[PDB]
Each structure stands twice: as C-alpha cells, then as structure tokens.
Design a protein around this ligand. Structure first.
Ligand SMILES: O=c1[nH]c(=O)c2nn[nH]c2[nH]1
Ligand SMILES: O=c1[nH]c(=O)c2nn[nH]c2[nH]1
Ligand SMILES: O=c1[nH]c(=O)c2nn[nH]c2[nH]1
Ligand SMILES: O=c1[nH]c(=O)c2nn[nH]c2[nH]1
Lengths: 295, 295, 296, 296
C-alpha cells in the first residue's frame, strides 16, 4: 500500500446553488435543498508510483503538502457551481488529477455536516428562519469516489458510492426474534414483542455514475428519501430479525429507485433490556449485520 | 463533603400519561407530549450524618447499595402517574426519603433522552408513525431537584431547576462583534457580519416549585418552547455579541413566562474561521459566557 | 451570575525550569519533573460588575475578547520562570488583574497534558530519550485558583486546589462488599472477593497557599506522589467498600503531607460482572459513585 | 456481501499462562508478559451461503444468536490455555467452525485492554503490586484472523495480522519538513525544526502464521518491541517527513524480525502550531495521514 492525504477537512459554504427538481417518492416529503448552508467533511487520499522516494529517500520534491490538499478542497468548494456532495467530489477529483500529473489515483470521502431549520416569528407569524439553523449530530449523508489516470491519460471513475450514516431507529412494538439456535451457548430468551433498536448505515450505487452528480436532478437519489423509506418500511413490517428488516428496506429502495444497482447495509442492534413497561441500557456488546441487496 | 449515589441510570418508559393542557406561545408549535416513549437518564446523590461510619469504619449496615438505588429509580418510573421529568424527580425524592429514615438530603438530575417522530406510508398516505422513533443526539431537556429532611421530619424541596441542554445554533448573517478592547494581546479583527455559532444551555427556575411538576399544565414551561424562543430571538436580533444575545433571549423568556423567577445561560462560541463564501473549523479554544436574567 | 472566558486553551512549553528539591515519601519514587515538555490546558473565567452593559446593552467597550485571553495565557507560558502549574496560574491571574483594572475576579483551571518517556538506542546503549515523548491519555494533574481585586486595588487568592484526575485502578482480589442493606430494592449479591475497579479523582488543599507554588519545593505535594499513595493503600487494604478505601487513602495522604488541610475524593465504581480461569465483562452503564472529604 | 456478528465483546481473564521465552532485540527491554490480568475486546463476524434465508425470509433456524456468540467468546477465554491474543483468536475460530457446520467463514478482531503496574509498600519495601493495576487508555496490541471451512470440512486460516494501535509520539526537535511543492495551493511555510507529533498504527504479518500464536515464543513478535523500535528510530532520525520516518521504522522492524513478511503503517500528523521559552498550541482539526507498507 502507498498513499497519503488529508482527513477532517471541514468546509462550510453559504448559498450553494440550490438542489431543485428532484423526483419525489411517496415515503418522503423531500423536494430539494435550499443550500443556504452547505457543510461537508472531506477526506482525500492520493497515490502514484512516483511517490515512492518521498518514503524511501525522504525526497519531498513531488510531495503536495497535505496542508495544500486542504487548501485545494476548500478553494474548490468556493468555486463549485453544482448542487451535491457527489458532484463536488467529482469536481475535486478531476481538478486534482488535472493539476498534478504525477498522481495516478485519488480517493475522496465527503460527509454531510447537517443543519436543521428553526422557528422564528415575524409579524406574529411563525415560520422557518432563513438565517438561523441548528447543527444536527444525528444522521448525515455521505459520498465516496475513486478516480484513476489510465495509461492513455484518460481519467476514469472506478468506484462511486453514496450513503446515509448514523440513523438510529427504535420501534416500540411489532418486532420479534424467535426460532434461533438454542444450544449450550444460548441464553437469550425468545421475544415475540421487542422494542427493536437499530443503528443503520445505508449505502447505494448507481447503474450510471453520472446520475449521482445531480446535474439531471430527476435521477438523483437523496439520502433524505432513503431515511424516510427506512422508517416507513420499519413501521409497516412485523420484523422477524434485523436481517429480515434490512432486506425489506433494500427491496423497497430498489423499487423506488430503479436507477440504483445495489443497496448495502451495516446495521447494529442496540435493543434495551426489559427491567408501565420500563427498559434500560444493555451491556456494551452489540450485534451487527452486513448485507447487500442487488437490483 | 459526604455523599454517594448512582449515575447514568437510564430508564425508558413506554406510554407514560400524556402531557396535555399546556399553554402554547407564538414562538412554538408545542402543545404537549404524546409520551409513547419517555426516556430519562437519572443521577441520584444522597447524604446524611449517619453515613459517616460507612467511610470511617467500613460499616455497610446503613448503606443502601448504589445498585439498589438504580432499581429504586427504575421501579418508580414504572409506577409514576405524572407527566414530567420534574415531577418524576419529586416522586423519587419523596419516596426515597420516606423509605430511608437515615438519609437527610437527596439531589436528583434527570436528563431527557429525546426521540423524534418519523414518516411512514399506508395506502398511499404518509403520516407520523406511532411506533417508529428516531433517537436524537441534539438538544435535550433537563431537571434538577434537591430535597431535605428537616429536624421536625417534614420534607422540603430546597432547590429546583429545569433546563435545555445541547442547543447548537448558527446564524449565517446579522451578527457583529466590534468595539472590544484592542491592546498588546488583541489579534481578533473586528467583524461586522459573522456567522455566529453558539452552543446554549438554558436553565430556568419557577417562582412556585409546584408549577414545575405539570399537575396544573397551564403553568408548565416546556424546554421545546424555550428552544423556539431562543431561535426566534436570535433570528430577529442584530447581535452585537453572545453576551448581548443571551440577555435578550432571557428577557423574552421571562416576558413570555411570568411564572418564572430566573433564566440562567451557559453559552459557548464555536464560530468558524473564514477561508461563494467558505468557512472552516477553528482551533480548539472556545469562548464562553454565563449569565442570569431575573424576573 | 455574570462571567465569561475561554476554555480549552492548550499550551505546550519546552524546557521549563525543572522541578527538583522535593521531599520524598515511602510510597513514591517521585523525585521531580524534567520539564523538557510542559503541557497544560487552561480555562479562564473573569467577572466584575463593570461587565454588566456588555450583556444588557451590547457595549463591548470593557470586553477583553476571549480570543485575547487565549493569547494572554499562551504568551505568559512563554515568559513563566517557575516550575508548577499551580505557580503558572498565579502568574497568569496576577498579571491579568494588573492589566485589566475593571476586572474584579478571575478563576483559572489548569489541567496537565502528560507525556511519558520512551527508549532509544544511541552510542551503544538504550536509554531514556531526551527528545521523543509519548502522549498519555491516562491520569493527569490539575490546579485551580481564584483571585479577586479588593477595593484598595490589592489582589488576593480566595481559593486554591490541586488534584489528580482520571486514575483508573483495578485490584483483582482482596476486596469485599457485604453487609449492605438487603430489602425489596436489592438484587446485588454479597461478594466476599470482587475485582474492585475504581475511578479516582483526588483533590487537595494546602494550609498555606504559598506551598502550592513550588517556590520552596520541599513543601510541594506532587500528584505523582498522591497516585502512588492511592495504589499502595489499595494494595495494602482488604477493602470493605469504596467508601472504606477512599477514607484510608485520604488518611495516608494527610499523614504523609502535614502541610495539607484536606483531601477530597470523587470515586466511581466500574467493577466488572463475573461470567477453568475466571472471566469478567463490562457491566451495564449505571455507575456508583462517592464524594468524600478527609480533613487534617 | 452477507455476514453478521458481535462487537465490543469485552472479556477479562485473570492468571492466564505467562508469556516467556521470547527473543530480545536491542531497542526493547521486553522479556514477556505476566498475564495476571489479560483483557481483550473481541469482534466476531461470520458468513455462509446457508444464512441467506435469514435475510430473505426471516427464517432464523440457522441463526446463531449474536448474544450466543458473546457467550461463546467469553467461555472460550475461560478455557484458553495459551499465551497470546493471536492464539486466542485461533482457538475461538477453530472451535466456532467445528461447532457450527453451516458457517463457512469467520473473521475475528481482538484488541488488548492494557493494564500497567503500580507501586505498593509492604513488608518493609516498595515494589510492583501483584494485585493492583492501572487501566491504560494509551497504545494497545491488536490481532486479526480470518478462517474458512473448505468443501472437505477442513479449516484454514486465510489471513492473519497483528498490530499496535494508538501510539502517539512527539519529538521536540530534530525534524524538518522542507522542499515540498510550493504552488498556488501552498501556504505552509518550510520548517527546518518542527516538533513532529505523529499518531501511529503499525501492523505486521508473519511469513508463517504459526509464529503468531506464541506456541514457540522465540518466533513471536511483541507489540511492546515494535513500540520500542518506533521510539528508537524516531529519536535516531533527523526526520525529513512522516513518510521518511515510517519507512525507516519499517525497515528496522523487518531487520529485527526476519520471520515477518511485511509491516504496514497508518500515521497521522498532529503537529502543534507555534504561537522567552518556545510555546505551541493545538492546530485546527484537519490532519495529514500516510498509509505505507514495507515488505521483506
Ligand atoms: O435481529 C436480531 N438478529 C440477530 O442475529 C440476533 N442475535 N441476537 N439477537 C438478535 N436480533
Ligand atoms: O460574542 C463574543 N463575545 C466575546 O466575548 C468574544 N471574544 N472574542 N469573540 C467574542 N465574541
Ligand atoms: O463499594 C461499594 N459501595 C457501594 O456503596 C456500593 N453499592 N453497590 N456496590 C457498591 N460498592
Ligand atoms: O511529514 C509531513 N508530510 C506531509 O506530507 C506533509 N504535508 N504537510 N505537512 C506534512 N508533513
């Protein structure tokens, strides 16, 4: 392995071009993003055989400083004329490879720093403020992009993946976990009605990576919409396990968004122990599941 | 000092009696709490001169196990018939002192564990779920109560305070910080238009402690309402400092709730450095302010 | 209440004057501090009635910017010629009140950012490096100071406290917790031999505030020494409770340091749950705690 | 992708068989591990085509409960008779695949929960306690293992890797970063003498997986020894970059441990910003990093 880069490149832009014209779906009110405030945390990794002597000889001649990579990202956010994190990563990646001919590969992560609307009163009327926003430490959209320079000097996206991270959902009833293996190691009781508490990371890949950019917004899949599909499916499903739940969420996603090729899940079980009905936090060990649904 | 207790007593109650009958204010849609899911994180501390030999001699005869205090709290959440964290603390405090004659003082903290509603579709109709909720790591309500046993064996609440913790607000424009002292230690440039980013912890005390319990809901002050006052005042104010903002928030709160005696603020400055406009995270050191507005 | 200030003022100084000439105790090999690297995390709070209109009117005329307080602290660590965090706080506090005559009260916290020695081979042998240090996220020393300006413009310290925070100690045997109240709220089994795991914050106050500064280092009480008393007493004692343990630690501290007026404990119980060999695991989140003062 | 499992399976064992008979190196005094307290945090992931209907149909007939996996791990730590985390993972993995014939693959991560010695006075002298230990939140050893079941029901290790995580080292002088690209994105000054502060995660792979277990301890590579190589090479080296340093650390590791095939680094730059004495402070959050393998 040989690469290097910069992490935790926070960048906040005001008044990015708004994202409008999205295709709505039944599960979600989402219809675009005002982009009064657009926050992203970027990580950049780069590689190329020509970097070898920066390691083996201490030769910094071909080292773009990681501090300069941070400047590069923040300055490109000031000039970005598009409307999504996905498109912003493509802009940064193409621009970086065009600038630095000795770089052969670039990997980018962008994580949304989300902000929510707040109430303000003007002339007695309460409505969403256009100035004051609330920083959210809950779920957030993500985007990943890998681009390479080929032998013929063409640039090519070899991987692209969008996502929703940090979704923590609890359903108070209508969940069971029964029928699992009972042997010398099994102490868990069957439960026909548990308050299933899952953490979800959900990632999707497009059949056509250009759909991820938002330039034709009707083909863009929004993390907000994915969130609302997950809650809808959770609500309507008498779940039989987390495994069963996440399969059904994935099927619904792929039904609503035929332009997607796959949906990938990382889920964690954080269900409370049962002590009106009162529950409490469990000991630290947590179950998890990882599963891809394909179109 | 001599006391002991139990922290991080998480307890989750389903279907607590709903909080209804509250007074609604223009700044906030708040009109009560459904209480399908009621989460609280409780800290209990107890004292009394008869505890002395548990320390000085290793005598456990008068030690209620801290583990038992956890059981006490969780069982009392199961039997609580009221509608507020503040009232639940009074229930626990009175019950504990009635149970254990050798305890002279009990302090309680209750911190809301907040859950937000989610969307679900049924037969082409999208609505709030009554089953699926989203765990929030953003702002949360708080309550504090200290109760003592007097020499005539009556019980007396000696301090009560409610609050809202963890509110993080950024206003993109309409904020200035100018006119401060410039001397050998001053490098901060004056700024007539900064995207002020404040963390707020807001606490209030009632003129009459009974109003905190929710027995008469018309007199209850909800943390949700405090939040929306704070965002509305931030929106409308051309801020001149954080100090200036929190004073005005406090005045508005006391105007809206004449049953309150005081509002106390703990604020922090997390405003980004300026690099379309793009900003980035500052170095770790953070400004802060602490101020009481009284009625 | 009315005050404001700056938190998380990190400041790393190289080659501070070393702390030597300390007085030893049986429980500790501590003999001083090299101070090749001296890290401290400072919080400053200031007050004064003349700050009122910065809140009530948005008048910044008498506001020292909190950013300037950061500069103030960092610049004073560069000029500090003493040997302790405690003395550094007195230097900052006196300097700040002299500089800003409208400020009536200043409160300072300083938390050590500790670094540990590492090994290097050079010139034929392995020895402690004078250049490479390891950042520790374990226990750390603390200091607290409050100073006021009186009507006549003199300055006075009104509270001083030193401490050791974040000490996490587990003793695998030789601890019991029996004989506690067993009633309708009790499900805890009695345990005659538990692996007691305590978190300890330990804070001490001097009879004479001057002794906290290090100027006469023989009167200084080092957090390293307090750590070593705590581990020794934990080892020595067949404990009967955390309560029992911390009283005994406190008594040993005040016996070893007669210049101390008192020692205050915040302890927490993190003892593991028991499942050929003995195995334990992490408990549920709820944690017991004790707060207790032993006085001279 | 299809797998499921259990994370944060903390397990603490007392009086595991000690690790001794190790082979020493010049950079390190490491001579073994007492194992009075042996703490590990385990993550287990399992897979197999026969699990499909647990997702597609909600059929749990072939689901080992993740809670049962936690019991499996903890009980196996009680019966483990070996001396390393690496060997513990092999014991768990082999045992789990033998128990559950429908599971085709298991991956395990084991992270050390490290404890440090403390001082106690008893019977006239101060010495290391055999009972009281200090929980450390600094660097820690790691182990990774993947095992598969073949068509003929034999089991094979398919990947093994050991490591040291969380090592945070600052060298106060004797580091430069100069000569890098200065173009329209460059605002970093050249620096001929910086206090380079790196975080290091170092992972190694053996030529022969058996050498990772400790059964013949002379062939085991201890994380403690890797730590001490890293601190020695950092001290010895007038560093020209983090990239330069980690290559030199990796070369030394491979020279000292010919039984290793390769060593892999993840480093992060956390060097302080410079504000009488020299004073530095914490930087803004963005951090540089490097990922690099040195092979034998
Ligand atoms: O949904 C669940 N899936 C599982 O695999 C499992 N194991 N224990 N509990 C569980 N719940
Ligand atoms: O609102 C502010 N108040 C202050 O006191 C301050 N100091 N620096 N920046 C500041 N901003
Ligand atoms: O040492 C202890 N003190 C206590 O008060 C207590 N309560 N539960 N366990 C305990 N252990
Ligand atoms: O050691 C370093 N390597 C780098 O690549 C770099 N970039 N900025 N500073 C740096 N330091």
């Amino acid at each position: 392995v040989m690469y290097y880069g910069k992490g935790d490149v926070f960048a906040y832009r005001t008044y990015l071009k708004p994202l409008t014209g999205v295709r709505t779906i039944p599960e979600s009110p989402f219809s675009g993003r005002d982009h009064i405030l657009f926050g992203v945390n970027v990580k950049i990794s780069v590689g190329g055989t020509k970097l070898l002597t920066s390691f083996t000889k201490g030769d910094n001649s071909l080292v773009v400083a990681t501090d300069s990579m941070k400047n590069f990202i923040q300055k490109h956010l000031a000039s970005y004329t598009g409307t999504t994190i996905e498109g912003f990563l493509e802009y940064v990646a193409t621009s970086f490879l065009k600038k630095y001919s000795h770089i052969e590969k670039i990997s980018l992560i962008g994580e949304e720093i989300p902000f929510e609307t707040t109430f303000a009163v003007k002339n007695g009327n309460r409505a969403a403020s256009e100035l004051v926003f609330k920083k959210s430490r809950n779920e957030y959209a993500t985007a990943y992009l890998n681009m390479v320079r080929n032998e013929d000097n063409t640039l090519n996206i070899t991987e692209q993946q969008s996502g929703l991270a940090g979704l923590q959902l609890i359903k108070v009833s209508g969940n069971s976990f029964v029928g699992f293996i009972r042997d010398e190691y099994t102490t868990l009781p069957e439960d026909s009605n548990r308050p299933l508490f899952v953490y979800l990371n959900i990632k999707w890949k497009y059949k056509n990576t250009e759909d991820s950019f938002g330039t034709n917004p009707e083909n863009y899949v929004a993390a907000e919409q994915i969130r609302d599909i997950a809650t809808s499916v959770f609500h309507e499903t008498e779940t039989l396990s987390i495994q069963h739940l996440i399969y059904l969420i994935g099927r619904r996603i792929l039904e609503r968004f035929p332009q997607l090729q796959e949906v990938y899940f990382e889920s964690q079980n954080h269900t409370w122990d049962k002590i009106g009905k009162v529950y409490t936090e469990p000991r630290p060990p947590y179950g998890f599941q990882c599963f891809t649904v394909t179109q």
